[PDB]
Design an enzyme around this catalytic site. Structure first.
Site, PDB file in Angstrom:
ATOM      1  N   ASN A   2       0.831  -1.177   0.000  1.00  0.00           N
ATOM      2  CA  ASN A   2       0.000   0.000   0.000  1.00  0.00           C
ATOM      3  C   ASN A   2       0.871   1.233   0.000  1.00  0.00           C
ATOM      4  O   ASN A   2       2.062   1.145   0.293  1.00  0.00           O
ATOM      5  CB  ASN A   2      -0.884  -0.039   1.229  1.00  0.00           C
ATOM      6  CG  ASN A   2      -1.814  -1.242   1.222  1.00  0.00           C
ATOM      7  OD1 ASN A   2      -2.528  -1.477   0.246  1.00  0.00           O
ATOM      8  ND2 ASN A   2      -1.785  -2.026   2.289  1.00  0.00           N
TER       9      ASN A   2
ATOM     10  N   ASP B 108       1.047   3.697   2.054  1.00  0.00           N
ATOM     11  CA  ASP B 108       1.604   3.977   3.363  1.00  0.00           C
ATOM     12  C   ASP B 108       2.759   3.058   3.783  1.00  0.00           C
ATOM     13  O   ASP B 108       3.214   3.136   4.917  1.00  0.00           O
ATOM     14  CB  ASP B 108       0.489   3.909   4.416  1.00  0.00           C
ATOM     15  CG  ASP B 108       0.008   2.494   4.674  1.00  0.00           C
ATOM     16  OD1 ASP B 108       0.027   1.663   3.752  1.00  0.00           O
ATOM     17  OD2 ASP B 108      -0.381   2.204   5.810  1.00  0.00           O
TER      18      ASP B 108
ATOM     19  N   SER C 237       2.656  -0.196   4.278  1.00  0.00           N
ATOM     20  CA  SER C 237       2.154  -1.465   4.798  1.00  0.00           C
ATOM     21  C   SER C 237       1.850  -2.426   3.639  1.00  0.00           C
ATOM     22  O   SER C 237       1.747  -2.019   2.482  1.00  0.00           O
ATOM     23  CB  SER C 237       0.904  -1.234   5.652  1.00  0.00           C
ATOM     24  OG  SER C 237      -0.174  -0.763   4.855  1.00  0.00           O
TER      25      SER C 237
ATOM     26  N   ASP D 245      -0.675  -5.953   2.443  1.00  0.00           N
ATOM     27  CA  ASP D 245      -1.817  -6.808   2.755  1.00  0.00           C
ATOM     28  C   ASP D 245      -1.421  -8.241   2.433  1.00  0.00           C
ATOM     29  O   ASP D 245      -0.798  -8.494   1.385  1.00  0.00           O
ATOM     30  CB  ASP D 245      -3.025  -6.402   1.930  1.00  0.00           C
ATOM     31  CG  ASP D 245      -3.516  -5.015   2.269  1.00  0.00           C
ATOM     32  OD1 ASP D 245      -3.228  -4.513   3.371  1.00  0.00           O
ATOM     33  OD2 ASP D 245      -4.206  -4.424   1.424  1.00  0.00           O
TER      34      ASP D 245
ATOM     35  N   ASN E  22      -3.880  -6.553   6.730  1.00  0.00           N
ATOM     36  CA  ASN E  22      -2.858  -5.508   6.763  1.00  0.00           C
ATOM     37  C   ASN E  22      -1.806  -5.587   7.873  1.00  0.00           C
ATOM     38  O   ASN E  22      -2.130  -5.833   9.040  1.00  0.00           O
ATOM     39  CB  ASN E  22      -3.567  -4.155   6.809  1.00  0.00           C
ATOM     40  CG  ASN E  22      -2.638  -2.997   6.585  1.00  0.00           C
ATOM     41  OD1 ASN E  22      -2.334  -2.252   7.506  1.00  0.00           O
ATOM     42  ND2 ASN E  22      -2.189  -2.829   5.362  1.00  0.00           N
TER      43      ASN E  22
ATOM     44  N   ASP F 122     -13.652  -5.846  15.717  1.00  0.00           N
ATOM     45  CA  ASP F 122     -13.085  -4.528  16.009  1.00  0.00           C
ATOM     46  C   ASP F 122     -14.055  -3.353  16.098  1.00  0.00           C
ATOM     47  O   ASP F 122     -13.711  -2.303  16.654  1.00  0.00           O
ATOM     48  CB  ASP F 122     -11.975  -4.200  15.007  1.00  0.00           C
ATOM     49  CG  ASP F 122     -10.772  -3.548  15.663  1.00  0.00           C
ATOM     50  OD1 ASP F 122     -10.360  -4.015  16.747  1.00  0.00           O
ATOM     51  OD2 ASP F 122     -10.233  -2.568  15.104  1.00  0.00           O
TER      52      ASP F 122
END
EC number: 3.2.1.17
Length: 127
Positions: free
Chosen positions: A44, A46, A48, A50, A57, A99
């Site tokens: 990604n 940023d 990070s 997946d 992630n 979550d």
């Protein structure tokens, strides 16, 4: 491993109606997240990445050692999510869906499964 639709549905029965989400929702997400391929990975913007069948992630859920500030809430190295045995993905997915945002945590589910006839995904499968 690249799963067949019905094969994956059977493999995912522990997720059937977990948190109110019928099995079709889980199979639909997997299709659009990894195309049923456990070895799928995607980096990604940023930094990070997946991982796996459900594209979990590295910023919050798993540790890959290259995502600064990562939390590893599922307490597992991201590579465990690429295994042909999807247990680790299933157990981490359970935490994510709990979550607070539900399956909206999966962008592909939100954009391509949410509000569709997801029952069609397990149609024809012997469960």
């Amino acid at each position: 491993k690249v799963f067949g639709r019905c094969e994956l549905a059977a493999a995912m029965k522990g997720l059937d109606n977990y948190r109110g989400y019928s099995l079709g929702n889980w199979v639909c997400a997997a299709k659009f997240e990894s195309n049923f391929n456990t070895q799928a990975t995607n980096r990604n913007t940023d930094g990070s990445t997946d991982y796996g069948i459900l594209q979990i992630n590295s910023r919050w859920w798993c540790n890959d050692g290259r995502t600064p500030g990562s939390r590893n809430l599922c307490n597992i190295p991201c590579s465990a999510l690429l295994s042909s045995d999807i247990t680790a993905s299933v157990n981490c997915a359970k935490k994510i869906v709990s979550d607070g945002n539900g399956m909206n945590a999966w962008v592909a589910w939100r954009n391509r499964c949410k509000g569709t006839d997801v029952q069609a995904w397990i149609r024809g499968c012997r469960l």
